[PDB]
Design a protein around this ligand. Sequence first.
Ligand SMILES: *[C@@H]1O[C@H](CO)[C@@H](O)[C@H](O)[C@H]1NC(C)=O
Ligand SMILES: *[C@@H]1O[C@H](CO)[C@@H](O)[C@H](O)[C@H]1NC(C)=O
Ligand SMILES: *[C@@H]1O[C@H](CO)[C@@H](O)[C@H](O)[C@H]1NC(C)=O
Ligand SMILES: *[C@@H]1O[C@H](CO)[C@@H](O)[C@H](O)[C@H]1NC(C)=O
Ligand SMILES: *[C@@H]1O[C@H](CO)[C@@H](O)[C@H](O)[C@H]1NC(C)=O
Ligand SMILES: *[C@@H]1O[C@H](CO)[C@@H](O)[C@H](O)[C@H]1NC(C)=O
Ligand SMILES: *[C@@H]1O[C@H](CO)[C@@H](O)[C@H](O)[C@H]1NC(C)=O
Ligand SMILES: *[C@@H]1O[C@H](CO)[C@@H](O)[C@H](O)[C@H]1NC(C)=O
Ligand SMILES: *[C@@H]1O[C@H](CO)[C@@H](O)[C@H](O)[C@H]1NC(C)=O
Ligand SMILES: *[C@@H]1O[C@H](CO)[C@@H](O)[C@H](O)[C@H]1NC(C)=O
Lengths: 48, 985, 29
Amino acid sequence: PVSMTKTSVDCTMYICGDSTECSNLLLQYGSFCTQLKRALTGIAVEQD
Amino acid sequence: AYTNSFTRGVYYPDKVFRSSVLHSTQDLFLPFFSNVTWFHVNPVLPFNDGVYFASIEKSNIIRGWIFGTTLDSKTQSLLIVNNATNVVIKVCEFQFCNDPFRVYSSANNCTFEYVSQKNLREFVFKNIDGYFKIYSKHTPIDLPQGFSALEPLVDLPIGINITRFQTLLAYYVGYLQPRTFLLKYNENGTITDAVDCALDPLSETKCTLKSFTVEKGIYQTSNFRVQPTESIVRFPNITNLCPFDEVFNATRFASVYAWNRKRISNCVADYSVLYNLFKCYGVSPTKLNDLCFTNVYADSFVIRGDEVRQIAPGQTGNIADYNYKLPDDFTGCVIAWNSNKLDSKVSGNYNYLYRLFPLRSYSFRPTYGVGHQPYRVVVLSFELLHAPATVCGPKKSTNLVKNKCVNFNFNGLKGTGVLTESNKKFLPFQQFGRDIADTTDAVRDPQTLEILDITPCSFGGVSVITPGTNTSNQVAVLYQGVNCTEVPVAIHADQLTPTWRVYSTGSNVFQTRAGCLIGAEYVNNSYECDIPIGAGICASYQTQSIIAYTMSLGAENSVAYSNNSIAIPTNFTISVTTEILPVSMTKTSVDCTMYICGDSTECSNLLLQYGSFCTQLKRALTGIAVEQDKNTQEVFAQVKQIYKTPPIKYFGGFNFSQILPDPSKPSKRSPIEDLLFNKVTLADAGFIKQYGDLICAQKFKGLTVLPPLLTDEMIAQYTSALLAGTITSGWTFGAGPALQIPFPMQMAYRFNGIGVTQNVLYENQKLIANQFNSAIGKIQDSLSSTPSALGKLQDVVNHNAQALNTLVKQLSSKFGAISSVLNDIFSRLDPPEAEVQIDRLITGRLQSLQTYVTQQLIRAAEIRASANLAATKMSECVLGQSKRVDFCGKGYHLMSFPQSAPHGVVFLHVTYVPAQEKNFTTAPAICHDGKAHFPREGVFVSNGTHWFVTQRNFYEPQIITTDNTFVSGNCDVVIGIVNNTVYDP
Amino acid sequence: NKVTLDLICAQKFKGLTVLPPLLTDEMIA
Ligand SMILES: *[C@@H]1O[C@H](CO)[C@@H](O)[C@H](O)[C@H]1NC(C)=O
Ligand SMILES: *[C@@H]1O[C@H](CO)[C@@H](O)[C@H](O)[C@H]1NC(C)=O
Ligand SMILES: *[C@@H]1O[C@H](CO)[C@@H](O)[C@H](O)[C@H]1NC(C)=O
Ligand SMILES: *[C@@H]1O[C@H](CO)[C@@H](O)[C@H](O)[C@H]1NC(C)=O
Ligand SMILES: *[C@@H]1O[C@H](CO)[C@@H](O)[C@H](O)[C@H]1NC(C)=O
Ligand SMILES: *[C@@H]1O[C@H](CO)[C@@H](O)[C@H](O)[C@H]1NC(C)=O
Ligand SMILES: *[C@@H]1O[C@H](CO)[C@@H](O)[C@H](O)[C@H]1NC(C)=O
Ligand SMILES: *[C@@H]1O[C@H](CO)[C@@H](O)[C@H](O)[C@H]1NC(C)=O
Ligand SMILES: *[C@@H]1O[C@H](CO)[C@@H](O)[C@H](O)[C@H]1NC(C)=O
Ligand SMILES: *[C@@H]1O[C@H](CO)[C@@H](O)[C@H](O)[C@H]1NC(C)=O
């Protein structure tokens, strides 16, 4: 094996899904998806 | 008349002082570069969702406003009026004049009054949660293009509905929209710039990274383009109305003693049909519809008005106690109404024989006082047994909207989405459809029975290709997994702002296997990848514009293969190349109690109940910290003896000044080592802090950096010992005692290693030495003027600093509690609820620390792999000569030199690169005297007429004698054997 | 042919996307 599937996540869609009420409650975390998205982006760049 | 708002209308979102920070705020803001209606001097404009109002003047002609819905005397209105020395604010049922400027006729029923106290005056008016918020700013000045934040002026508890407003007399009116803005606070304290996240793709990128400067690259953004949604309810076509018509229009009602009891059940009960004919207990009339019951028990009878009060919970009159005893507590709706014109028989209605003791008769006349008159009563008792409810209200339904993001409720299934018909074929009994996620994706319409396929609205964020904000503000947008005919429908590029719709079409549109790219011109020229888009497509800044292109793999080069031709190098190059390897990372310590429970003792005593979490975290981080010193030791502490180079630094013309220690500096670092030391910027370095920036913030939150065991000076000493050992003894000091050997003789050994005879080095000693010296000088030069050569080490440093800053910022999360401040929770709530809130906060912060530690463990495993590779390189490239291809540089490895870099090692690999090749004819073997000869160590080459034997990596032709070939067999097997003479000496 | 390389749409409707590799199979070939 040389590379794995590159995946990307959008928290707002996965956690909330078009729901504005949930989207506005998810801003009290904020850095947790910045961190998760940054981790997955690092993985994708590493695959390339 | 319309004008450009530019970036006016920003105001301070809250009352908290902030300094040197970027803060995101979702509020009602005037969007940047909006259209402002300009009035010169007073019409009634709408209010919508708040207003921005600017006035450039010098005379004070504009000095007030009215706000309201009708602005007539039938509705409450707000009036703000400045005067010579005061501002008067009133809320009353004003009767405003046709043209107010004396502004109203009547002022009845006031509710609130409050009196207080070229120029540009800006105001922002908002009406939220019953409060009229006013922000303002005044400057001495099209509308200016500076940035100026409005400060809060007053919040008034007016509690009215406002839809339109008018000014009391140039002046400009703009409308606030729900937006997220990224605000920049200065240090001397001020809002000095802002980003409108919904303006355009670059602003979306800036709000996604929470920064005002973006580096070159491609960024996945979060969706800041917020669209409205309407609501649609769809319930089954009602049918089956309850038989209530028979209990409220029956000709003759029963008598209170012989009262009736109907059991209305299994139907829809429209109680609203009343109000056209109503004291409800244990229930409110307005909720009756959306409630359900097992069986509403409808009793009906007739009494005299004086007795209607007795039909109620808690009364104890004669009827309430001798005819119809209604419990003191119950649910229902006593519906009474005078029916004298339906129950007053002339001469006396002796049809309502009421009990009193045994029982007498009411006997109404059509002339009785209001008093004792026929009054019909329907007691609608309700039920709530555990048995299923079967009596319910109408359950009204809305119309159906299609192809619009909507909040829907189909027969009790709620959700947001876009309904777009469907082709799915449900079974007749199936009502919904679910997808792989076990989430609803199709619904059958309860009324029309058609099947609608639910799809998400807002496919999310997009990818933005930027050359960097420093260079340009031009961007391209990639929509992933979409073709360039559906992009405008996908992003809903009709409700978007302008400057966003420019990125949905425009003939600068290119399709890729990754999706649609708009804003870049696809050239057919192929270059190296600059910004990777994917599927072979890259982007770059041409200079002037963003160009997309297919990536180029490299220069094509056909090799002239032939059955008898060989290219042999006639010259060589001594190449010196660098290899940067991380060895260690920052050692970090966390004070678990300080991070989770900062300065709160109750929080600490609660934290004592979550087990060994903090102990496990401390153990993991201590393991990482020890592993870092073990990494450094395994890389640099290979030799046990500290070797020294001789005082005289002559090595056959080889010049190591740039790598050897330099005594003219306290650190004794080498010049290249000094350059590397000044090219990587450390954050903390773990050294004493004297009580009295970001390091201070982290330290106050309990996060510290521990110093490495080996100092930079000791690592430099290890490097210098390695360098001296290799310069003065070759590879011997790695295998046993260091055996001295002159450097040219050692270099001859290393030339032998790569398969070129020793003479080649002894005969080219000066050229080889000068090539090496020039290569080392080029290494220094391309380091003193290289943009990011130490990017790997700097990446280690930045990753550690960024993780620590993320930890510090995650302390502002509430995790669903009332506040992120433990002290406020304890000072506002009693233990019973404070426990819930504090448990939330402690769990959230424990999870944040655990995430940090897990990421540190993973990164430490990566760094340990890198340090193991560095130790292997030190053993096999510095302590020996490697035959492994590309392990110690590109080319035939000669030797390597280590140099300590702040958090890692740099290897200077010296390799031998053949050069200046020449074609020759060649044969497998040479036939002579009927015997086949094969070259001992060489290949047969021909200058065209004569045949020589040469070494393979350097052209040194020799006469083909019997001391450089060997005989095996005859000339009848070897396919290609050539006829020539072997000079038997 | 030997490695088996609506579900993807269903996931993408939940925020999860599979990004294409930068180098195509033809470039790797
Ligand atoms: C302002 O109005 C003009 C036409 O009246 C329109 O072309 C432009 O896009 C508008 N700008 C904004 C930001 O709505
Ligand atoms: C803060 O005030 C000082 C004193 O007048 C001024 O010199 C300085 O410019 C202000 N802040 C900054 C960052 O300039
Ligand atoms: C309710 O009436 C509409 C009008 O024709 C009809 O389409 C629908 O099928 C009816 N509901 C039921 C359950 O039959
Ligand atoms: C997008 O739709 C167009 C219009 O028919 C079609 O030519 C193209 O192949 C489609 N692309 C994708 C990726 O579905
Ligand atoms: C030798 O090379 C020539 C030219 O490439 C070719 O024509 C010939 O077929 C080769 N030898 C054999 C035995 O095929
Ligand atoms: C080999 O290259 C060097 C330059 O690096 C040159 O001075 C020398 O003359 C070359 N040797 C031959 C035999 O051409
Ligand atoms: C070695 O090179 C350095 C830097 O190029 C130079 O300063 C020094 O004089 C050189 N030493 C000798 C002996 O040529
Ligand atoms: C060998 O000959 C081929 C074809 O004549 C030519 O392309 C190639 O450059 C030559 N090689 C050298 C080292 O001159
Ligand atoms: C034979 O090879 C030698 C190389 O040692 C060269 O000097 C000479 O010119 C060659 N002879 C012919 C005829 O090419
Ligand atoms: C070498 O000489 C012999 C002598 O008869 C001859 O038969 C043979 O063909 C020659 N070899 C080649 C490769 O021409």
